[PDB]
Design a protein around this ligand. Structure first.
Ligand SMILES: Cc1cc2nc3c(=O)[nH]c(=O)nc-3n(C[C@H](O)[C@H](O)[C@H](O)COP(=O)(O)O)c2cc1C
Ligand SMILES: Cc1cc2nc3c(=O)[nH]c(=O)nc-3n(C[C@H](O)[C@H](O)[C@H](O)COP(=O)(O)O)c2cc1C
Ligand SMILES: CC(C)(C)OC(=O)N1CCc2cc(CCc3c(C(=O)O)[nH]c(=O)[nH]c3=O)ccc21
Ligand SMILES: CC(C)(C)OC(=O)N1CCc2cc(CCc3c(C(=O)O)[nH]c(=O)[nH]c3=O)ccc21
Lengths: 313, 313
């Protein structure tokens, strides 16, 4: 029985990794994720310049999940490029570097510089499309013209295999259209579904108040709230993007949730809210739990069930 | 008590009602909701002709909510019109009729027949926008130009105050655009936020199978999964549509949940999944619970806290 994966010309001990933005902002965080039993890690989404992010409180968690409006606090691209180029021990596990520029030009500028490091060290790019562009326009991945522009320019500037982090969609015509855009770009080799469910609002009944300060309390939702949304997205893209990998993210707290992701088509499985809340010890639990479900069912490898979710009639 | 309230020229004993599609399809269902302690009821969304709906199983519930792909099973518009004109006892509580034709023309044909019954008896129209357009296009509310057309045509054909049932949005630019469309129609006097969160996917780990038959297991989500999404939408519309009322729907299981919807801006509060699961006795529990929260806080009216959610700093 084994959790090993080979993909993207890397080897992974298991499919688990942090979701971007969790336990991955500082050198300390990145060393901590490396020391964990995760099969990979991804760095905090970066911008060209360091950022302080939004005013606090900007993250809160609850029994059913979390809400955030972090605002891209990060140490800046040079820091993450350095971590990838000089500090990361690739004999421990593979490294993904997430980028989230606030314009197409900013993304092009970062990927041009990443490319020689990616070629030489094997760091993998995850481009975050579930982000702001022009205020008053939708996030990039909800504006299919902007999305196409971003992927054209990044493909040209990077010239190497990469992946994309996608917001959730809620409408079959949007799945159709989004996957068709992605399928224009052969360098897009993995699709991460999903980023937070956007612009939720948590209200505390005792205080009669929202729980995060930015944006009048509106923020993206993670955790138990979003598992069926995440599974739908992983399967929708798994079905529409047969020459690409799908990584699942959203609502994983247990090996059973991970099992569901993998049945829907996930290769790697990312852990956000549950990791923020429990800490990196979660990875040993998730491994043990997933192996226990496999052993009950007689599955010996991930391939033997990945994408094999059954439909009715 | 009491939680009595007046709007749209009608008087309501309390803010609670069923959500469209729950306990409202048959004469039996409608008489059951009428006999309940709810302050109002709404009929199943109808089409011109009777419909069987999609294959079963098409609804499933779980501790955190529900998933459905019902496919508009209903008795047809002639039935619901007859119920509104001849059968409903308006002395018990107000009635709303939900219309969900599959084209703009179908909606126009139904509203021109409803209009005289609305004038004579006081039935209220809820137009469901969270309904399919042409297949291969997004649902109507997700296509702003189609939405505008629907509303111009209905407004013209109907000529009386009505409301609309909206899908959730997840992007502030979308809230801006959608509210601006609705505000172009002075006959749209109430906005119901929200319909189910679209196209989720629930998988059963033991059977390794999706849990509903239509659409390869994809369906709209209701219940605990969607409460922060519902609150955000209620609040976003409440803020943007100061000359309309907002009706809250999504994730109400308790008077506390209802309390949160009203803080967010809700005038009426609709109950779907929790009503499907608990039955119509839920309305006496919700009233008791809401009045207890009120008494503990010193609130004597809903108007004292409606829309008064506090932001930070
Ligand atoms: C505190 C916080 C920070 C996040 N930062 C980023 C980010 O920098 N880039 C990104 O792609 N996603 C970010 N996300 C989204 C997560 O990567 C993940 O997609 C989302 O939380 C859903 O997974 P979950 O249900 O396991 O939380 C962040 C989430 C949280 C809670
Ligand atoms: C079985 C079922 C049938 C439904 N049918 C309709 C409908 O006919 N028209 C409508 O506007 N919404 C319909 N809905 C959506 C609900 O009215 C409601 O918006 C959604 O379930 C979210 O509320 P909840 O969290 O209380 O379930 C239906 C929901 C369910 C669960
Ligand atoms: C640039 C400006 C307007 C300060 O941005 C923001 O207010 N936000 C709030 C949410 C957000 C998200 C992003 C993308 C990074 C990200 C974040 C994040 O850093 O807040 N949180 C997530 O859950 N997923 C993400 O992909 C960037 C900017 C902003
Ligand atoms: C016309 C056709 C293709 C059979 O429709 C469908 O398969 N569906 C699946 C979901 C759906 C919804 C609607 C709108 C009525 C409705 C339904 C419903 O009847 O399925 N469920 C909800 O959660 N909200 C709704 O607003 C109409 C058609 C369809």
């Amino acid at each position: 029985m084994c959790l090993k994966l080979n993909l993207l010309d890397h080897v992974f001990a298991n499919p688990f990794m942090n979701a971007a933005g969790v336990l991955c902002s500082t050198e300390e965080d990145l060393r901590c994720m490396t020391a964990s039993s995760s099969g990979a890690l991804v760095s905090k989404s970066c911008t060209s310049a360091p950022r302080d992010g939004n005013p606090e409180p900007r993250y809160m968690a609850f029994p059913l999940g979390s809400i955030n409006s972090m605002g891209l606090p990060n140490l800046g691209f040079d820091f993450y490029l350095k971590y990838a180029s000089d500090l990361h021990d690739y004999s421990k596990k593979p490294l993904f570097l997430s980028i989230s520029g606030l314009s197409v030009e900013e993304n092009v500028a970062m990927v041009r510089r990443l490319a020689p490091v990616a070629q030489e060290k094997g760091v993998l790019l995850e481009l975050n499309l579930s982000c702001p562009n022009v205020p008053g326009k939708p996030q990039v991945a909800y504006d299919f013209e902007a999305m196409r522009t971003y992927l054209q320019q990044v493909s040209l500037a990077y010239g190497l295999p990469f992946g994309v982090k996608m917001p959730p969609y809620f409408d079959i015509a949007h799945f159709d259209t989004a996957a068709a855009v992605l399928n224009e770009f052969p360098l897009v080799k993995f699709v991460t579904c999903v980023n937070s469910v956007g612009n939720g609002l948590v209200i505390d009944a005792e205080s009669e108040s929202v729980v995060i300060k930015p944006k009048q309390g509106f923020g993206g939702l993670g955790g138990k709230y979003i598992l069926p949304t995440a599974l739908a997205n992983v399967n929708a893209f798994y079905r529409r993007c047969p020459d690409k990998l799908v990584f699942g993210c959203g609502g994983v707290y247990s090996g059973e949730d991970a099992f569901l992701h993998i049945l829907a088509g996930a290769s790697m499985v990312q852990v956000g809210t549950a990791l923020q809340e429990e800490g990196p010890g979660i990875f040993t639990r998730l491994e043990d739990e997933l192996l226990e479900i496999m052993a009950r069912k007689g599955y010996r490898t991930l391939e033997e069930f990945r994408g094999r979710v059954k439909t009715i009639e």
